[PDB]
Amino acid sequence: DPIADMIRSLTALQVLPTAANTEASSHRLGTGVVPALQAA
Amino acid sequence: SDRVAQLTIGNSTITTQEAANIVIAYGEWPEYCPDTDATAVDKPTRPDVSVNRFFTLDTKSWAKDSKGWYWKFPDVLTEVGVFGQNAQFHYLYRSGFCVHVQCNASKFHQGALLVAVLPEYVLGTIAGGTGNENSHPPYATTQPGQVGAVLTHPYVLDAGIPLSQLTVCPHQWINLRTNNCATIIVPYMNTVPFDSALNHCNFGLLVIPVVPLDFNTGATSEIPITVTIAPMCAEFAGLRQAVKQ
Ligand SMILES: [Cl-]
Ligand SMILES: [K+]
Ligand code: NA
CA of A24 to the centre of ligand 3 (A): 20
Among B32, B37, B41, B45, the strongest candidate for a mutation testing the A interface, having the largest count of A CBs within 10 A, is: B41
Compute the distance between CA of residue B6 and CA of residue A24 in angstroms, rounded to an integer: 37
Burial of B96 (0-12, 13-18, 19+ CB in 10 A): buried
How far away is chain A from the Cα of B41, in angstroms, using its nearest Cα? 7
- Other Cβ atoms less than 10 A from the Cβ of B145: the count is 18
Considering only CA atoms, which of B187, B163, B183 is closest in space to residue B173?
Answer: B183
How is residue B44 annotated by DSSP? P
Residue B113 forms beta bridges with which residues?
Answer: B174, B209
CA of A19 to the centre of ligand 2 (A): 5
From residue B199, alpha-carbon distances to B91, B100, B195 in Å are: 10, 25, 8
- Structural Rg of chain B based on CA atoms: 19
> How was this entry determined?
X-ray
Compute the distance between CA of residue B176 and CA of residue B215 in angstroms, rounded to an integer: 11
Compute the distance between CA of residue B84 and CA of residue B93 in angstroms, rounded to an integer: 11
- Provide DSSP, A1-40: ---TT----S------SSPPP---------SS--TT----
The pairing of beta strand B5-9 with beta strand B149-150 = unpaired
Chain A residues lying within 8 Å of B41, measured CB to CB: 22
What's CA B75's distance to the chain center, in Å?
A: 10
List the alpha helices (DSSP H) in chain B: 81-89, 139-142
Compute the distance between CA of residue B61 and CA of residue B95 in angstroms, rounded to an integer: 29
Listed by start position, the domains of chain B span 1-245
For residues B157, B225, B20, B100, the Cα torsion angle rounded to the nearest 10 degrees is 80
What's the reported resolution, in angstroms, to a tenth?
A: 2.7
The CATH label, of 1.10.3210.10, 3.90.1200.10, 2.60.120.20, 3.20.10.10, for the domain at B1-245 is 2.60.120.20
Chain A residues lying within 8 Å of B44, measured CB to CB: none
